[PDB]
Design a protein around this ligand. Structure first.
Ligand SMILES: Nc1ncnc2c1ncn2[C@@H]1O[C@H](COP(=O)(O)OP(=O)(O)NP(=O)(O)O)[C@@H](O)[C@H]1O
Ligand SMILES: Nc1ncnc2c1ncn2[C@@H]1O[C@H](COP(=O)(O)OP(=O)(O)NP(=O)(O)O)[C@@H](O)[C@H]1O
Ligand SMILES: [Mg+2]
Ligand SMILES: [Mg+2]
Ligand SMILES: [Zn+2]
Ligand SMILES: [Zn+2]
Lengths: 268, 227, 623, 608
DNA sequence: TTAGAGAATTGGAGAGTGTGTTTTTTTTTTTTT
DNA sequence: CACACACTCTCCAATTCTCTAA
């Protein structure tokens, strides 16, 4: 998924009211166009029925822009992309960056040459009406009962610390410190931080970055970013024009996004 | 805005002081009833390409008398006490040498470049302000207030048609005369290296935004600076 | 639009006069012969000399130049009659036979500045430099439509304000029969013609004092649609017209003016016995040419030899594996103030073909390579060539090269290394050819060269860039009184010179349109220094010789390359200007090839190899 | 000009009666045999060859070439009128439009262009020599032309409406609208007599199921750079491709397109404004793109490893060590990339290796790190502002995706590109914002870097990062760091100069008195040797450990503990597995580990 | 008491008139380098 | 420019009112 639009309301039933006598009627949607009443029924005035927008009925719609997977692209080619349209409950189930198997009906629709003229291009636009989404990159008492006795097992501290990052050769006190950072103190109120701050030092080519990436994959509300100015997501907060909308958005940095977690800062 | 017509076209150039005689009028093909105004020029008096014969023969007389060099030098900045050698050099700068093209096509500069450099309160700025007013073609600019583009020539797009055009700087506006660069020590070095070609070769070679040309900048540089 | 009625009586009189002019049989047969060649070469534009038309019929020539359109259609109809008389089969291949004009046009010779509204409807000859070209696009002149319901073909012919026709014409493309049936275009049976717009700019050296150069738009059609490209100095003969426009029931009386060209002439590069006699009679013609190269600059003999090698160029080699060796020779001059670097660059600008001026602070990378601009005709964005692209198969002279930005020199890296520049802008990702020699001039850091610092820190440029130049000369203002005496003698002699057509007290005139014929009117040692006019033609003929390398000269070059490598080894880190590499060997091959071109030898001899080795020795091993 | 009614019968006679001999002098009607397949829907595209037409009517060929589109329509009409003569089987309906047409026919028993499911194209005559794009002038409008060029942009295949099918809601009748123009007016109200006479007010609903679509694809061709004139920009032409001609060509492909050169039709306000001028496109009609026993007996020679390494750079002497390392670059380790960096003075045969490996590699690129004015190491956006559509170009790293990217002057790479190299070497992809929206590109490629010292010649007195001025975060990603030294050396210089002078005076490599393997044989060998996927045996783990620790401890004892890490062992294993692939054995062994260790040690020896 | 023939009023078909449209580079300036 | 929308006016004929016969 490359982008996901704002929620688009699609009219399902138009509500008309007579501006002369307040008599109301309802019109059903015929393949995207309204059969507007040209006359009122109670009275008989012509062109008196006005569309009451917020008494009409609407349903959710959303546009999604979906790129072919990197694992599926042919060698050295720029990726292809399709447009999906989801409606009702399937609208708010997919975010940008997700990988999905989408089942839907492959539609083809005309596009008018300019908005005030009904001539259409011979070459049709295509999109997929979404019928089903399946995410394919996602990866209680029965746990509490295990954890209660495992907590009173001997040297559970050492067991958890050694469980941290099995893929690297062991630095006992580093792993112990990261474990105590994960658990943290107790937050109470005055103003004292329960958060624990840890710093790792060493040459490039040490296991410090592997530790950072591991615990970022582990912890909830985690973040991973570089102190270098070329980082994917910044540490500080900033304001930017949302390019697909042009309206301002306050992008709070990783330190604010990790307000109840661990912020991993590589190249500090 | 001025509308000129028939023989009033090319009667003036930028930098000229004029007295315009004309009809104040609206264009006739921010607000509602707003109309853009201009003057339809009916006459131009350049305040000051021709000398009357009386001026001409008087100039012959003035050149003929034997102490014309001393008379000119005493005419340079008469309100300034002293500095006779500096005034004489300024007279030489005002009159200039002779430009030449040699048989192989190479050009030799004719204009004279003069730098005044040193103590404050020594009337350097007054000499520049005199020379800018006395030279037939003359522009005064501060070194601090100038840039490379604004001195030589600048490239910019026109809102009326999306294409890159050139606009002349100080050197182009003073082509055929003198540029009086006051505060010459204050300008940036990157801006100061812009005028080397225009000082010696008396040309400005621009290659920017696709437009590639070589303008003329046949002008003297009279510069004032401090230690 | 475009249809105009003409008086048939004067049209027939003019057509009679022009057919009499073209039927040149009883006289020398010049235009009989030219129309025969027009038929034979499969051409349909005849270039007529108004000098000949004035000799035969002076009043008709004057009326032609002052009443261009009606007289030109009369002339073209006469030409169609005459070509039909010679070959009636060939006359039907083309809808119209065109006439372009050459010769002297009197007062109609103009520049874009003096081309005022008084010249509208006249034939004018405008001399200038091309600054823009649009893309060649087809223009419908005659469309055939097949009506499938009615089973008949209609044929319609068109015109616009640009295309004045003197026959009835439309300007609306039909889509329905008179019975309201649909019409199908027969594209193959329709006729279209190529159309392009260019802009001709005033020569900058001829502009008045405070002024920027002015411009005129030119419309080229048919064979003329790609006869001039940007940077060409050209003479365009055509009819000067205004285009009366309208905008929704209203017109501003301001009309744009265009030159509808009828003839385009280049002003560059345009018998063998004198050159053959020169190469056979002279001993070391390379030396005579080199010392004759820039007379107004005293000394700098080796630099003049190197610049002559740059002008002659090496030979371009393409190998069976697709690897490539450039023929262009690149020269860098680092030196003190007032050692004539700029004047040498200006000489090469004045004398070489397609020599592009550039300076470090006056230019940018975009202007050096290529820019996005919008075609004013269309509005679409497209590329516009920069200086090094315009300099393809030519020279770019970069003065003040040390003052240039590194970001600007990034482009010069690709151009010098590979002879190309790659771009990704507008709708186009492309590889433009920039096969140009570079003649760069720079000052050392600290202005004046410092004897108590190494050459590689006097030269402010990095060795990666310095590797691109074949030759690197250090030019020092040695204050030896002997050289000062002879240099000052030469300089004062130059400053005492005056031209022959000029009085003793004359100040230098500002330029004007003094060229008043489409071809040169006046048209090997000096008036034993070689003449400049001869030397231009000689270098033109010598550039195309393409001599082959010979085995003994190759052996000599190999021996001397290995010896130069040993000298590089023994040299201290202060006693060299550049290290010796395989590119030094390539430089030796290129310089020997250029010397062979100077001799017009067709084979690289030991004579060439010796001078190449001497020049490389001189350039490389200095401090 | 001609009577098209008679021309259609001439075309029918050609299609029915032309014959050619294919095998043993047997006579076959090449177009009747294809009309049979067209009638049976076994074949959809019919490429009629005007070289075949020339064998019995050159005048018809001239008429077709001079008025091609008219004759294309005539040939299509003739073929459609001929297919019922060649019907002899029932069609298996596989398109939903086949099913709809089947029920349409049954209901008619109870739209010619609609019933027409085939497409006819002229394969150009050989007398028409291929033009360049610049030579396709206005005189050739409406005429069959062959044009050579570089494909530089290709759109996705889109559905182009040919015949719009509608259904009425009131009278239950189908309505058909053939579409010739690039735009059309949709039908709103039913034109049937039953609705019109009754004033029924019944409207029309488009049925895509019943309508006919055709595959459509726009592309841009560009001039060959060496064919452009000296001072000029390369010209470009739009080619509109339909049906079976779609998907034949991709960007970067050298193509020759036979087609019809036509002006673009305009609607609304464009025809008002443009006047007599028109843009043009080429209507594509045909697009053309421009060991095991015998050499195994050669490969059986024990030379083969050194034979390949010698063939990797025959113009260079003494560097067989480096050539073997670059062989392992091309082979790659077991899944896997192998990255190499070469350091040396400017003006040395270090770019020669980049050139050779780029030439030999099947998928490759060869750029420079010095901030290209084109598409850089990473992707870039093009606006195409005749229409304004943004489009994405790959760059070096993306265009060398499943191969090798050669980077010259790797040190002068800016930080914006160094971060991209980090992205490639860490996770083998790059990411770019097209219009504020971010798209991800594959780059699963091995990097062959060549750096130069920041200032002056190389100086072993200083450290490597001091020489090159590039951080250890870059330098540690590489598997072999080589110093390609160059000293003056009299006899070697003499031989190099003799070699280059022979190359100049003969335009060919001198006889070296060695027979290297040809480039195609080398390519087939590397594919055959990289098809293998070896595995390291567990019994060799102790020996790998011993070699790694002794190399590590030698670095401790003799070179002040210069940097090494676990990626050193990983690089040794990747090199040994690449050697196993090269030897075409699916088990790694002592000799592979020894040679990997030796290769790393000699690269460090070149540094020291 | 229904309904049908002649006269007048209202519905709407259609003829006529008017409106709107088809990333890029050089330069400055403050802050940050 | 010229090809679609948007809006007004006019005429034509179809329906309903009025007066008469079945
Ligand atoms: N010799 C003089 N005769 C008359 N006025 C003088 C003289 N010297 C200085 N002044 C006056 O001193 C003031 C400063 O003159 P100015 O031209 O600015 O000198 P300056 O050398 O340019 N000063 P500075 O810009 O600090 O170097 C003016 O009001 C002059 O009139
Ligand atoms: N050897 C010479 N013979 C004749 N004229 C010379 C010589 N050296 C310098 N000149 C003259 O000195 C003037 C300045 O020359 P110029 O071409 O600017 O040298 P330059 O080194 O390029 N100046 P610069 O840009 O500061 O380095 C010109 O008028 C030259 O003709
Ligand atoms: Mg002052
Ligand atoms: Mg200079
Ligand atoms: Zn109502
Ligand atoms: Zn219907």
């Amino acid at each position: 998924v490359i982008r996901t639009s704002q929620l688009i309301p699609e009219m399902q039933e138009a509500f008309f009211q007579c501006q002369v006598c307040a008599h109301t009627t309802r019109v059903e949607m015929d393949r995207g166009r309204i059969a507007e009443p040209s006359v009122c029924g109670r009275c008989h005035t012509t062109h008196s029925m006005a569309l009451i927008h917020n008494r009409s009925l609407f349903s959710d719609k959303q546009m999604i822009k979906l790129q072919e997977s990197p694992e599926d692209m042919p060698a050295g080619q720029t990726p292809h992309t399709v447009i999906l349209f989801a409606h009702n409950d399937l609208v708010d189930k997919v975010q940008p960056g997700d990988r999905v198997n989408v089942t839907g009906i492959y539609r083809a629709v005309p596009i008018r040459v300019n908005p005030r003229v009904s001539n259409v291009k011979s070459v049709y636009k295509t999109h997929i009406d979404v019928i089903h989404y399946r995410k394919t990159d996602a990866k209680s008492e029965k746990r509490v009962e295990l954890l209660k006795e495992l907590s009173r097992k001997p040297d559970i501290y050492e067991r958890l610390a050694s469980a941290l990052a099995p893929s690297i050769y062991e630095h006992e006190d580093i792993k112990k410190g990261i474990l105590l950072q994960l658990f943290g103190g107790t937050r109470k109120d005055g103003k004292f931080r329960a958060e624990i701050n840890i710093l790792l030092c060493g040459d490039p080519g040490t296991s410090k970055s592997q530790l950072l990436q591991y615990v970022y994959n582990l912890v909830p509300r985690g973040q991973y970013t570089s102190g270098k100015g070329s980082s994917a997501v910044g540490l500080t907060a900033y304001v930017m024009k949302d390019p697909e909308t042009r309206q301002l958005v306050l992008q709070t940095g990783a330190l604010v996004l990790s307000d109840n977690g661990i912020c991993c800062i590589d190249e500090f | 805005q001025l509308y000129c017509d028939r023989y009033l076209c090319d009667k003036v150039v930028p930098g000229n002081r004029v007295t315009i005689m004309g009809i104040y009028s609206i264009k006739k093909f921010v607000g509602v009833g707003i109309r853009s105004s201009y003057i339809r020029v009916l006459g131009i008096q350049v305040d000051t390409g021709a000398v009357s014969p009386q001026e001409e023969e008087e100039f012959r007389r003035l050149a003929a008398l034997p102490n014309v060099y001393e008379v000119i030098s005493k005419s340079i900045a008469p309100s300034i006490f002293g500095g006779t050698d500096m005034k004489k050099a300024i007279a030489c700068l005002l009159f200039g040498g002779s430009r030449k093209r040699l048989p192989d096509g190479l050009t030799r500069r004719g204009d004279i470049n003069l730098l005044m450099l040193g103590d404050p309160g020594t009337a350097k700025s007054q000499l520049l302000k005199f020379v800018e007013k006395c030279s037939p073609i003359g522009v005064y600019t501060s070194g601090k207030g100038s840039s490379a583009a604004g001195l030589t020539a600048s490239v910019m797009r026109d809102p009326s048609s999306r294409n890159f055009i050139m606009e002349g700087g100080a050197m182009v506006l003073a082509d055929g005369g003198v540029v009086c660069i006051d505060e010459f020590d204050k300008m940036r070095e990157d801006d100061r290296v812009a005028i080397h070609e225009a000082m010696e070769q008396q040309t400005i070679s621009i290659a920017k935004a696709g437009i590639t040309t070589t303008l003329n900048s046949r002008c003297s540089v009279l510069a004032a600076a401090n230690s | 639009a475009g249809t105009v009625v003409l008086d048939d009586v004067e049209l027939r009189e003019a057509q009679r006069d022009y057919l009499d002019f073209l039927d040149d049989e009883e006289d020398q047969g010049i235009y009989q012969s030219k129309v025969r060649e027009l038929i034979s070469d499969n051409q349909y534009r005849l270039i007529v000399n108004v000098n000949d038309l004035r000799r035969k019929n002076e009043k008709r020539a004057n009326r032609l130049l002052n009443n261009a359109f009606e007289e030109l259609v009369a002339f073209q109809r006469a030409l169609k009659d005459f070509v039909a008389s010679i070959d009636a089969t060939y006359a039907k291949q083309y809808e119209e036979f065109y006439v372009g004009l050459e010769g002297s046009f009197g007062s109609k010779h103009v520049s874009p500045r003096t081309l005022t509204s008084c010249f509208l409807s006249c034939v004018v000859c405008v001399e200038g430099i091309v600054t823009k070209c649009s893309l060649v696009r087809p223009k419908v002149v005659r469309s055939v439509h097949y009506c499938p319901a009615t089973k008949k073909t209609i044929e319609r012919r068109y015109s616009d304000l640009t295309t004045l026709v003197a026959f009835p014409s439309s300007s609306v493309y039909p889509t329905k029969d008179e019975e309201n049936n649909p019409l199908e275009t027969e594209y193959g049976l329709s006729v279209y013609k190529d159309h392009q717009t260019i802009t001709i700019q005033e020569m900058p050296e001829k502009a008045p004092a405070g002024q920027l150069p002015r411009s005129v738009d030119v419309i080229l059609d048919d064979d003329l649609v790609d006869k001039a490209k940007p940077g060409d100095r050209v003479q365009v003969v055509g009819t000067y017209r205004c285009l009366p426009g309208k905008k929704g029931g209203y017109t501003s009386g301001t009309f744009r003016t265009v030159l509808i060209a009828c003839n385009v002439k280049q002003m560059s590069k345009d018998i063998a016995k004198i050159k053959k006699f020169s190469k056979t009679r002279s001993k070391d013609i390379f030396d005579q040419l080199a010392k004759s190269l820039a007379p107004s600059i005293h000394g700098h003999d080796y630099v003049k030899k190197a610049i002559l090698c740059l002008l002659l160029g090496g030979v371009e080699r393409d190998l069976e594996n697709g690897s490539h060796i450039r023929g262009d020779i690149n020269i860098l001059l680092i030196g003190d103030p007032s050692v004539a670097k700029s004047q040498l660059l200006r000489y090469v600008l004045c004398t070489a073909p397609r020599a592009i001026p550039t300076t470090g602070r006056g230019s940018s990378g975009v202007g050096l390579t290529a820019a996005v601009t919008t075609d004013q005709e269309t509005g679409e964005r497209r590329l516009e060539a920069g200086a090094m692209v315009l300099a393809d198969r030519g020279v770019v002279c970069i003065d003040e090269f040390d003052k240039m930005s590194d970001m600007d020199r990034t482009a010069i890296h690709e151009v010098m290394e590979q002879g190309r520049v790659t771009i990704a802008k507008a709708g186009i990702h492309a590889r433009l050819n920039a096969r140009c020699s570079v003649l760069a001039a720079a000052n050392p850091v600290y202005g004046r060269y410092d004897q108590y610092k190494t050459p590689m820190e006097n030269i402010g440029l990095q060795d990666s860039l310095l590797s691109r130049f074949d030759l690197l000369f250090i030019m020092l203002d040695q204050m030896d009184p002997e050289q000062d005496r002879e240099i000052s003698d030469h300089v004062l002699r130059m400053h005492r010179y005056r031209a022959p057509g000029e009085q003793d007290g004359d100040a230098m005139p500002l330029g004007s349109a003094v060229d008043i014929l489409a071809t040169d009117d006046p048209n090997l040692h000096g008036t034993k220094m070689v003449s400049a006019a001869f030397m231009k033609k000689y270098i033109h003929v010598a550039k195309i010789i393409k001599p082959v390398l010979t085995q003994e000269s190759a052996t000599y070059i190999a021996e001397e390359y290995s010896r130069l490598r040993s000298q590089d080894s023994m040299s201290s880190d202060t006693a060299r200007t550049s290290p010796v590499t395989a590119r030094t060997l390539e430089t030796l091959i290129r310089l020997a090839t250029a010397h062979a071109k100077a001799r017009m030898s067709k084979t690289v001899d030991l004579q060439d190899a010796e001078e190449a080795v001497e020049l490389v020795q001189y350039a490389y091993f200095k401090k | 000009l001609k009577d098209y009614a008679l021309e259609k019968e001439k075309v029918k006679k050609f299609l029915q009666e032309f014959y050619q001999d294919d095998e043993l002098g047997k006579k076959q009607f090449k177009y009747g045999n294809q009309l049979v397949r067209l009638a049976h829907r076994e074949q959809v595209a019919l490429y009629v060859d005007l070289d075949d037409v020339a064998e019995d009517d050159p005048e018809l060929v001239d008429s077709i070439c001079e008025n091609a589109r008219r004759y294309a329509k005539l040939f299509a009409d003739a073929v459609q009128e001929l297919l019922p003569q060649y019907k002899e089987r029932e069609v298996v309906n596989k398109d939903v439009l086949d099913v709809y047409i089947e029920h349409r026919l049954m209901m008619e028993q109870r739209p010619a262009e609609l019933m027409r499911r085939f497409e006819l194209y002229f394969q150009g005559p050989s007398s028409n020599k291929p033009r360049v794009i610049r030579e396709v002038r206005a005189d050739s409008v409406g005429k069959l032309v062959t044009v050579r060029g570089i494909v530089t942009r290709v759109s996705e295949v889109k559905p182009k409406m040919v015949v719009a099918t509608y259904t009425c809601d009131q009278c239950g009748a189908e309505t058909y609208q053939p579409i010739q123009s690039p735009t059309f007016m949709p039908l709103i109200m039913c034109p049937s007599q039953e609705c019109q006479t009754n004033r029924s007010g019944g409207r029309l609903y488009l049925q895509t199921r019943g309508s006919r679509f055709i595959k459509f694809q726009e592309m841009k061709m560009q001039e060959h750079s060496d064919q452009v004139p000296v001072g000029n920009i390369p010209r470009s032409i739009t080619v509109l491709v339909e049906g079976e001609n779609t998907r034949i060509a991709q960007p970067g492909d050298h193509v020759s397109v036979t087609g019809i050169f036509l002006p673009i039709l305009r609607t609304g306000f464009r025809q008002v404004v443009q006047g007599l001028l028109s843009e043009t496109y080429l209507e594509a009609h045909r697009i053309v793109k421009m060991l095991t026993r015998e050499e195994l007996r050669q490969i059986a020679e024990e030379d083969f490893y050194e034979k390949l390494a010698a063939s990797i750079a025959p113009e260079i002497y003494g560097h067989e060590d480096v050539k073997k390392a670059l062989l392992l670059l091309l082979v790659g380790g077991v899944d896997g990339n192998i990255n190499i960096c070469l350091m040396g003075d400017p003006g040395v045969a270090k770019s020669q290796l980049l050139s050779y490996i780029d030439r030999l590699a099947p998928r490759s690129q060869y750029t420079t790190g010095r901030g290209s004015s084109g598409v850089g190491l990473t992707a870039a956006v093009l606006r195409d502002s005749v229409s304004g559509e943004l489009t994405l170009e790959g760059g070096a790293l993306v265009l060398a995706d499943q191969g090798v990217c050669c980077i010259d002057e790797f040190d002068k790479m800016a930080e914006a590109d160094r971060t991209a190299i980090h992205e490639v070497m860490e996770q083998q992809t790059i990411s770019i914002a097209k219009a504020g929206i971010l798209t991800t590109l594959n780059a699963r490629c091995s990097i062959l870097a060549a750096a130069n010292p920041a200032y002056g010649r190389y100086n072993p007195r200083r450290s490597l990062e001091q020489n090159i001025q590039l951080p250890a975060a870059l330098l540690s990603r590489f598997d072999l760091l080589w110093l390609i030294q160059d000293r003056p050396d009299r006899d070697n210089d003499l031989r190099l100069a003799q070699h280059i002078t022979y190359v100049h005076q003969h335009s060919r490599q001198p006889p070296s008195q060695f027979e290297p393997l040809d480039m195609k044989l080398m390519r087939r060998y590397i594919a055959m040797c990289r098809e293998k996927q070896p595995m390291v045996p567990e019994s060799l783990a102790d020996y790998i450990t011993a070699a790694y620790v002794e190399m590590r401890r030698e670095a401790w004892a003799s070179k002040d503990a210069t940097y090494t890490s676990a990626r050193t062992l990983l690089a040794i294993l990747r090199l040994s597995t690449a050697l196993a692939r090269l030897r075409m054995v699916d088990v790694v062994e002592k000799e592979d580990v020894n040679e990997a260790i030796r290769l790393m040690e000699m690269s460090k020896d070149s540094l020291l």
